[PDB]
């Protein structure tokens, strides 16, 4: 069940097929799926405590001893030193969510963990995993259609930023800057609205410079309609 196959032939003469076959490992069939589901469940259960306004940060320490206290799911999984391949798949999923959207990088991991956890008990009852995947795809289509149905539209005009401010506040609610919550949402909305092509076109993040400097207070963070240069 492990290490692959080992017979050394029925005639006693050596029977070697793959280089270093005695040093390699092999998992097959249902127990491989169970191991993968267990690893993904572990990752998702680790991440799920940092979900929502009452989420708790994770204190990440890299190989050099530098400390990164953070709540972002993609950052946490990126700095996590994993060796399991399914954990790497979880990390890549978080990175994908961060790149495409930028928010919800923790919800994807919890959702994937829940889906695999349910698929475990489905597999225990003798359902082919491809059937589970097909059912998941069907239900995902239904859920996406329902989201489109129950969705609501907001105005993205520059003369009324209240819905935009509310959305930014909701995004920031789970972060440590919730003390300066409204100011942070205000500056983020103004920054995006200032540098953007109004015909629903792209927003060039290269035109937004995020600069940090120690000292002062967190409330001193401000949006500057210009450039702050590190020179004199």
């Amino acid at each position: 069940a492990s290490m692959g196959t080992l017979a050394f032939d029925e005639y006693g003469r050596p029977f070697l097929i793959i280089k270093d076959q005695d040093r390699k490992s092999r998992l097959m069939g249902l127990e491989a799926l169970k191991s993968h589901i267990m690893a993904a469940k572990a990752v998702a259960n680790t991440m799920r405590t940092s979900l929502g306004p009452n989420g708790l940060d994770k204190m990440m320490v890299d190989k050099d001893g530098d400390v990164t206290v953070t709540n972002d799911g993609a950052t946490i999984l990126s700095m996590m030193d994993v060796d399991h391949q399914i954990a790497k798949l979880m990390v890549e999923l978080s990175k994908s969510q961060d790149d495409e959207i930028g928010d919800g990088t923790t919800g994807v991991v919890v959702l994937a963990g829940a889906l695999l956890e349910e698929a475990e008990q489905l597999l225990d009852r003798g359902i082919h995993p491809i059937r589970i995947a097909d059912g998941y795809e069907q239900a995902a289509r239904v859920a996406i259609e329902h989201l489109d149905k129950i969705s609501d539209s907001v105005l993205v005009d520059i003369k009324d930023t209240e819905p935009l401010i509310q959305t930014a506040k909701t995004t920031l609610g789970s972060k440590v800057v919730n003390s300066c919550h409204r100011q942070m949402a205000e500056i983020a909305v103004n920054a995006v609205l200032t540098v953007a092509d109004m015909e629903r076109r792209d927003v060039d993040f290269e035109l937004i410079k995020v600069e940090g400097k120690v000292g002062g207070r967190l409330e001193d963070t401000k949006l500057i309609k210009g450039v702050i240069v590190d020179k004199d």
Partner: protein, 526 residues
């Protein structure tokens, strides 16, 4: 953690490789001693792992001193030992014959012939070999001592003792003749037990003789006893002549002051009673396999009796056979018939720096000793081996009075007979038949090679001679390398030796041809 259906140290080899390896191993064993055959053979030096030196040209000794790893070589060694034990001669011949038959069998195995066919052909060949050997034999009058001496000579012309031919022949013949014994309607010779060979380094080989009695490396227990008795009456014993503890636990308890002295006096009285019982038969010599007490020695010297102690059981049996005595264990049951009368002289004399006891004038002795005097221990060991071969040949002739021409004449005659017989089979096994028949030519070929003459010319001439009608006794002269009639040269061999050699060689070839798998390395699992 490998699966390991078989053990890790188990190795398997199979196929043509196994057969080729077995046949090559047999050929190598043959080549070791190929040159040690014939009158012109050369001796070999064998270094004993214990530090000794064995210098010989006997085939069995050479093969016995060699350690080998290939199991086919072990089989060949066992074949040599079997031939030596069964008849005592023809060891080199049987080894060479087995090697040659295995070679000619490999010839067919290389082609698409199954080994069973070769084995069946070999067995048919062996049957015809036996038939022809019995056919070409001649009878022998065992009464004629000259013919027996000639046979022993022909046996020992190829050994280092051949320089002293008449002496060795007479020694062997006399020893066998006076060890021959018959009782209760059963006849026996028993060269192994009686007819002891005792070698004393020094002197000259011409002084070697077989005594009409036995000789042991023993001396009188007390110097006052006579060392030269004319017509002794010998009494043999096993039990010690000394006070001994009983079998059961026999603790004593002494409370009276005079019991200790009494007990010691009873010990002395017991010794005196045993000695008196022995003396009652009026003997002159007392031999014991165990100790003799000093007080017993005194009591025996009081009666003028020579006493020898701590004699080996084999030596004591030999003495009993020689002097017509019977070993007894309880002196109180000693009878007149047990007293050994028949020894005509007993003499203890010094040889070199050591005493030797001689009982050497027995009338009609059924046991004997052979006193070998020579240059050193190795020379005497080789002389003993040659004389053992001579005695074995003499015994074989005495049991079976058939003779067979030597010098390779019998080999060529049998080969020609089998070749002529093979012309009528017209089957598929005729070829192995003819091959194993012509494999017998390795004996005359080896004789010619050792002699140094041209092999091809002499074998061609010999085959042409044997193609005639009355030429079964034509062989190869071992010295001049010429074709001579063996009824003129006089070299003859016992039929038993030839039969045993042929049988053993053919059967070895059959046994080794039968194997095609080798597995090794497994545990003993005793």
């Amino acid at each position: 953690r490998p699966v390991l259906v078989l053990s890790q140290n188990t190795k398997r080899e199979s196929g043509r490789k196994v057969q080729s390896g077995n046949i090559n191993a047999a050929k190598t064993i043959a080549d070791i001693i190929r040159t040690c055959l014939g009158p012109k053979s050369m001796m070999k030096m064998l270094l004993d792992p214990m530090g000794g030196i064995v210098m010989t040209n006997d085939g069995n000794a050479i093969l016995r001193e060699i350690q080998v790893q290939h199991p086919a070589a072990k089989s060949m060694i066992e074949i040599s030992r079997t031939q030596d034990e069964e008849v005592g001669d023809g060891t080199t011949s049987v080894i060479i014959l087995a090697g040659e038959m295995l070679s000619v069998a490999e010839h067919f195995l290389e082609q698409q012939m199954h080994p069973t066919v070769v084995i069946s052909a070999y067995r048919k060949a062996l049957d015809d070999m036996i038939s022809t050997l019995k056919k070409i034999s001649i009878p022998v009058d065992i009464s004629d001592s000259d013919m027996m001496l000639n046979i022993i000579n022909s046996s020992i012309t190829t050994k280092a003792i051949s320089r002293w031919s008449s002496l060795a022949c007479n020694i062997a013949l006399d020893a066998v003749k006076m060890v021959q014994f018959e009782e209760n309607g059963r006849k026996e010779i028993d060269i192994k037990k009686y007819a002891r060979v005792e070698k004393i380094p020094g002197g000259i080989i011409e002084d070697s003789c077989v005594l009409r009695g036995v000789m042991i490396n023993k001396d009188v227990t007390h110097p006052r006893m006579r060392r030269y008795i004319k017509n002794p009456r010998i009494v043999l014993l096993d039990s010690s002549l000394e006070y001994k503890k009983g079998e059961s636990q026999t603790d004593i308890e002494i409370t009276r002051e005079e019991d200790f002295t009494r007990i010691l006096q009873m010990e002395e009285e017991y010794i005196q009673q045993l000695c008196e019982d022995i003396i009652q038969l009026k003997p002159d010599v007392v031999i014991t396999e165990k100790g003799i007490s000093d007080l017993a020695q005194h009591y025996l010297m009081r009666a003028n009796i020579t006493a020898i102690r701590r004699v080996r059981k084999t030596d004591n049996n030999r003495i009993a056979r020689a002097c017509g005595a019977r070993i007894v264990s309880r002196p109180e049951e000693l009878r007149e018939d047990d007293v050994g009368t028949g020894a005509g002289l007993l003499e203890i004399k010094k040889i070199g720096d050591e005493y030797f006891t001689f009982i050497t004038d027995c009338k009609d002795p059924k046991a004997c000793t052979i006193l070998l005097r020579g240059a050193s221990k190795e020379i005497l060991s080789e002389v003993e081996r040659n004389l053992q071969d001579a005695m074995q040949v003499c015994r074989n002739v005495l049991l079976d009075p058939q003779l067979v021409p030597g010098g390779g004449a019998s080999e060529m005659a049998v080969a020609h007979a089998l070749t002529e017989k093979s012309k009528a089979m017209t089957g598929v096994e005729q070829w192995p038949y003819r091959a194993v028949a012509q494999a017998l030519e390795v004996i005359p070929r080896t004789l010619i090679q050792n002699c140094g003459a041209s092999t091809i010319r002499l074998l061609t001439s010999l085959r042409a001679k044997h193609t005639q009608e009355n030429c079964e006794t034509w062989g190869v002269n071992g010295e001049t390398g010429t074709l001579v009639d063996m009824k003129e040269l006089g070299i003859w061999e016992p039929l038993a030796v030839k039969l045993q050699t042929y049988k053993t060689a053919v059967e070895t070839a059959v046994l080794l041809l039968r194997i095609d798998d080798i597995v090794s390395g497994h545990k003993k699992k005793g």
